[PDB]
Ligand binder design. Sequence first.
Ligand SMILES: [Cl-]
Ligand SMILES: [Cl-]
Ligand SMILES: [Cu+2]
Ligand SMILES: [Cu+2]
Ligand SMILES: [Cu+2]
Ligand SMILES: [Cu+2]
Ligand SMILES: [Cu+2]
Ligand SMILES: [Cu+2]
Ligand SMILES: [Cu+2]
Ligand SMILES: [Cu+2]
Lengths: 128, 128, 128, 128
Amino acid sequence: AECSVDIQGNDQFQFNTNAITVDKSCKQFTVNLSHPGNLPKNVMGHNWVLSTAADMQGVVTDGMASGLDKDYLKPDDSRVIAHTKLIGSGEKDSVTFDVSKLKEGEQYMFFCTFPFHSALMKGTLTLK
Amino acid sequence: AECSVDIQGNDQFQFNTNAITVDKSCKQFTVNLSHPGNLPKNVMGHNWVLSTAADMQGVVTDGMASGLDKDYLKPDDSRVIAHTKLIGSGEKDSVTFDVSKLKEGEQYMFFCTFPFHSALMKGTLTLK
Amino acid sequence: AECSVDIQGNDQFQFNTNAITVDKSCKQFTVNLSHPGNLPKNVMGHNWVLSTAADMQGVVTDGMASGLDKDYLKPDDSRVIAHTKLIGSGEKDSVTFDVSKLKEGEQYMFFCTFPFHSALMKGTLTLK
Amino acid sequence: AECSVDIQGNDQFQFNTNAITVDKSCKQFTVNLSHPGNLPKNVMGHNWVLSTAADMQGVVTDGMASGLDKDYLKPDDSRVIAHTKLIGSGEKDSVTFDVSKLKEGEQYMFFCTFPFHSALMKGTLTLK
Ligand SMILES: [Cl-]
Ligand SMILES: [Cl-]
Ligand SMILES: [Cu+2]
Ligand SMILES: [Cu+2]
Ligand SMILES: [Cu+2]
Ligand SMILES: [Cu+2]
Ligand SMILES: [Cu+2]
Ligand SMILES: [Cu+2]
Ligand SMILES: [Cu+2]
Ligand SMILES: [Cu+2]
């Protein structure tokens, strides 16, 4: 089974998927994020951030407040299972994480923490 | 706190929200669904269906198969916590359900079961 | 034929339609805009603004620069055929305009001028 | 200036852009379409089709009727300025066309002609 996904965030406040499936046979999983938009990261930056559903709101809320200089993530935030850096137009970044960090019966959300984006830039991540 | 939400499904494969919050002080909760599109229910029907996240895929899969005559829900499907009827252009329908049917620590999804719509017509429902 | 449309802008950077049809038999046309989101107008304000397609970019660009105090429209901007005020959570506003302001063979765009929203909050308006 | 764009259509009824700009200095322009979804072309096929805004509705309407076997385009449809083939999960296709086929003062639409998709799978194409 494939153990990676390519994700884009654009100038229209959108990721190109709202649902990621990680096959239970994967040992690692890689997200390759790119920004095919034209706007710079100070006005339209995106990241890809994974947390439990229960933790999403706190990660987004604390992240928003940290500013462009912290990639809109609270420093030393243990709620963050895995994440990319914040990118703007023409940039890309990849994150690989150990699938053993995910459990069944738990449900996960991915999202961007740039101010206000998560209302549309969010989706589910699930083992199967 | 408010204990109802107005939801629309349109001709563009979209609900007008992807996240519903039910205040923990509500005893009942009402969803008022409408279809401001122009297309009829045989080609662009929508419903609003609530289940646990774990049950969503089975409800959608079994529902799809039941046809326009069953409102695209498997008969006697106990996985369905609450739902509206399937509606087309110009129609509306409301459902009220007991908030005691929802628990904390559990996470819920709403979605439309008309064939293929749930890939975009879906969102989270959470107590708070 | 109907000569009005109800439009919503939400917390997810979206209008609930991307295509408005004005029947050629209408003498006036009314847009009723509402904001069913929770965010205030300083962070998630929306308006509904009509212009020719050729004029859209200049209206959006000049509008962005005018600030919350000008409802993000350049004062005395003759390019604006019709528009609502800028609204935030829980507010609504209606605009009525004369259909004789529109021509056939010309093509029109509607959009929100709040900073950056028009990349997703836009659509076509056409006589038929 | 760049004279190509990469476009995706997914399982969620979406292209990853709603606005294409063709630089006036381009002599040719290339669209590279891919389908990163999982669904096959009989249920979730996509193409990329360019026409004038005035011609869009007729191309979509006549195209819909032609069936999977005709890639949902009416044979010998002179309204089609350029187009890709219809693709499903895991497929890709590119089209190159002469920029001299486009004029200023005219306004263009791109869209998918698979049944009903164009309500969301559409956008503008403009010279600049
Ligand atoms: Cl979701
Ligand atoms: Cl458009
Ligand atoms: Cu494998
Ligand atoms: Cu973002
Ligand atoms: Cu109350
Ligand atoms: Cu539906
Ligand atoms: Cu009338
Ligand atoms: Cu807006
Ligand atoms: Cu060049
Ligand atoms: Cu399509």
